[PDB]
């Protein structure tokens, strides 16, 4: 009937679950000491006034005043953060051949850093790896604006002088094409795992319903808010509270804490 965290772990142990799909959000980022915008952080952000938060990811605002966005980019630009244990756990899932797909709401790029190959990833809100001139459309490796950003200078096209914008997806914009994998990944999965997000926001929320009835949906996260609440299913399992704790429990139940430990150790030194 109602399943437990341990059941789930045992189903994974017992490779009854071999094709896990994972969706993550900001709850797995805050432990790497990435800020949460949803304070204190805005120390970086509030100053030039955002008239309201979402402006950070509105184009018209950005055109009128890009400074706040680039403060944020400077914070998250790769180098300046490291994968925490929850990434490394998803890395272990991959390395054991168990991971069909990881969908991430985070723009920190910590999943690739952690070691998960690009083919396993969907970066549904984009990436700082790359950029794109807001006017002329010419695209750029991410490093060719590193220093401007690192100096708090607003980068500018050589071609046309417009503002050059990292390929983070703004409000209003099409998500990546790679998002469209969901149609085949979700019905192929035999476990859905949701970490550090409740998925209140479409079109993530609607994604949750695309797995078959038989397939356990495990959330580890402080709350439930989204469609696990609106439309619960019998094989659902909620492990509410602190993300890291939740995941520590699950690794103990898998029997993987020592192997995790080994992996963390090797990558820290790499």
């Amino acid at each position: 009937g109602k399943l437990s965290l341990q059941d789930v772990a045992e189903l994974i142990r017992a490779r009854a679950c071999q094709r896990v799909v994972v969706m993550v959000g900001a709850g797995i980022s805050t432990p790497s000491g990435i800020p949460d915008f949803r304070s204190g952080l805005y120390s970086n952000l509030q100053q030039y006034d955002l008239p309201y938060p979402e402006a950070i990811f509105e184009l018209p605002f950005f055109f009128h005043n890009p400074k706040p966005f680039f403060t944020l980019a400077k914070e998250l630009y790769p180098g300046n953060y490291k994968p925490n244990v929850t990434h490394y756990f998803l890395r272990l899932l991959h390395d054991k051949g168990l991971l069909l797909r990881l969908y991430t709401q985070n723009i920190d790029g910590l999943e690739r850093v952690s070691g998960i190959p690009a083919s396993k990833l969907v970066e549904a809100h984009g990436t700082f790896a790359s950029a794109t001139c807001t006017v002329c459309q010419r695209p750029f490796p991410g490093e060719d604006i590193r220093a401007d950003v690192m100096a708090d200078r607003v980068p500018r096209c050589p071609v046309c002088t417009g503002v050059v914008k990292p390929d983070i997806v703004f409000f209003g914009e099409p998500l990546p094409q790679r998002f469209l994998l969901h149609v085949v990944d979700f019905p192929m999965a035999d476990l859905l795992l949701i970490l550090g997000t409740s998925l209140e926001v479409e079109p993530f929320a609607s994604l949750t319903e695309a797995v078959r009835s038989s397939v356990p949906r495990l959330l580890i996260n402080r709350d439930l808010v989204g469609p696990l609440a609106w439309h619960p299913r019998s094989r659902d399992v909620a492990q509410l509270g602190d993300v890291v704790h939740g995941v520590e429990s699950l690794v103990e139940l898998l029997g993987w804490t020592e192997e995790m430990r080994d992996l963390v150790q090797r990558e820290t030194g790499k």
């Binding site: 990811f57 997806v169 703004f170 209003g172 914009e173 099409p174 998500l175 998002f179 469209l180």
Partner: peptide, 4 residues
């Protein structure tokens, strides 16, 4: 094609 779907929008953020």
């Amino acid at each position: 094609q779907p929008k953020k």
